[PDB]
């Protein structure tokens, strides 16, 4: 699975966070499926600060990056999988595209930087957890 490395922060899907993530916790929110932990090394990624609805995401289950149009971050209902239950998720963006369990954490990027990470899949839709509202990732 994938993550964002910005400053001394590591941004992951909450349900895939490790014990080391939880032991170095900065912030977490179940409703968004996001968790941020602290890092010793500085990261290479820049977070987008924008309202773009077009970008490119990485799909591990295809070994491919795909250009997509996506919705603005919203409170959305997510169906059950073969291996997890159904629930409302907040700050979620949807696009038409392929995702499945191996694709968690793939980056969605726009011309301004990282928009979010792959979070959901079903019925030809990929959902992304937005990070562009988390301005505190840019400092401290």
Ligand X SMILES: *[C@@H](C)C(=O)c1ccc2c(c1)NC(=O)CO2
Residues found near ligand X in the complex (CB under 6 A)? 13, 81-84, 99-101, 103-104, 118-122
Quote the CA–CA distance of 104 and 56 in Å, as a whole number.
15
Residue 83 or residue 139: which is nearer to ligand X going by CB? Answer: 83
CA separation, residue 18 to residues 21, 76, 121 (Å):
5, 26, 22
Quote the CA–CA distance of 88 and 68 in Å, as a whole number.
23
Catalytic site includes residue 15: yes
Q: How far is the CB of 111 from ligand X (least distance, A)?
A: 23
State the binding partner of 110 from Zn ion, ligand X, none, CB within 5 to 8 A by kind: Zn ion
Beta bridge mates, 13: 34
State the binding partner of 13 from ligand X, Zn ion, none, CB within 5 to 8 A by kind: ligand X
Q: Is 50 annotated as a binding residue?
A: yes
Quote the CA–CA distance of 139 and 90 in Å, as a whole number.
24
Binding site for Zn ion (CB under 5 A): 48, 50, 52, 110, 112
As annotated, the active-site residues are 15, 33, 104
């Amino acid at each position: 699975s994938g993550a964002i490395y910005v400053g001394n922060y590591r941004v992951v899907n909450r349900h895939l966070a490790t014990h080391n993530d939880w032991a170095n916790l900065v912030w977490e929110d179940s409703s968004r499926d996001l968790l941020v932990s602290s890092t010793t090394a500085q990261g290479c990624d820049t977070i987008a600060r924008c309202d773009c609805q077009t970008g490119v995401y990485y799909c591990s289950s295809r070994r491919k990056h795909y250009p997509v149009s996506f919705s603005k971050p919203s409170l959305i209902f997510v169906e059950a999988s073969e291996y997890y239950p159904a629930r409302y998720q907040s700050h979620l963006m949807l696009a038409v595209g392929h995702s499945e369990p191996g694709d968690c954490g793939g980056i969605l990027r726009c011309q301004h930087g990282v928009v979010g990470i792959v979070s959901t899949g079903g019925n030809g839709l990929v959902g992304f957890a937005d990070v562009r509202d988390l301005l505190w990732l840019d400092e401290e």
